[PDB]
Design an enzyme around this catalytic site. Structure first.
Site: not given
Length: 146
Positions: A42, A96, A114, A137, A140
């Site tokens: 991702h 990330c 998630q 978060s 993505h």
């Protein structure tokens, strides 16, 4: 016909039909072609309302949710044009620590990630890429590799 999540739609600009997937947010002109685990990479762009507004890239992430989506949209454009590889953008710009592994998260089953990420990941076929995928978060782009 049409695999899970895929539907037909009408292009506003061109009048031609295209295909959209409401689970992955993928969209393409071409008509599209369950395992226990999938493997995905991702690219994450965080924003001010992310569950945790910080990353290895910057200590205080200040961009808006709207500005994050514009960044994601531009990366998708670069990937789809072949101007840039997914892995190269993930390594440079993903918010990330998976950036250090070209965005690879490894294999996972349902019930680990998630939920929006999981659903998009399992609705991709091997080799396919998502559109924008929203979690707490951030936003993505997901690439299914296995």
């Amino acid at each position: 016909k049409l695999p899970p999540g895929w539907e037909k739609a009408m292009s506003r600009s061109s009048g031609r039909v295209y295909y959209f997937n409401h689970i992955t947010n993928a969209s393409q002109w071409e008509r599209p072609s369950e395992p226990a685990r999938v493997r995905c990479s991702h690219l994450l762009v965080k924003h001010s309302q992310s569950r945790r507004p910080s990353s290895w890239r910057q200590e205080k992430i200040t961009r808006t949710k709207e500005e994050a989506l514009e960044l994601i949209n531009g990366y998708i454009q670069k990937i789809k044009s072949g101007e840039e590889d997914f892995e190269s953008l993930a390594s440079q710009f993903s918010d990330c620590s998976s950036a250090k592994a070209r965005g690879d998260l490894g294999a996972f089953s349902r019930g680990q990630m998630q939920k929006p990420f999981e659903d998009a990941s399992f609705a991709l076929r091997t080799g396919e890429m998502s559109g924008p995928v929203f979690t707490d978060s951030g936003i993505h782009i997901i690439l299914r590799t296995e």
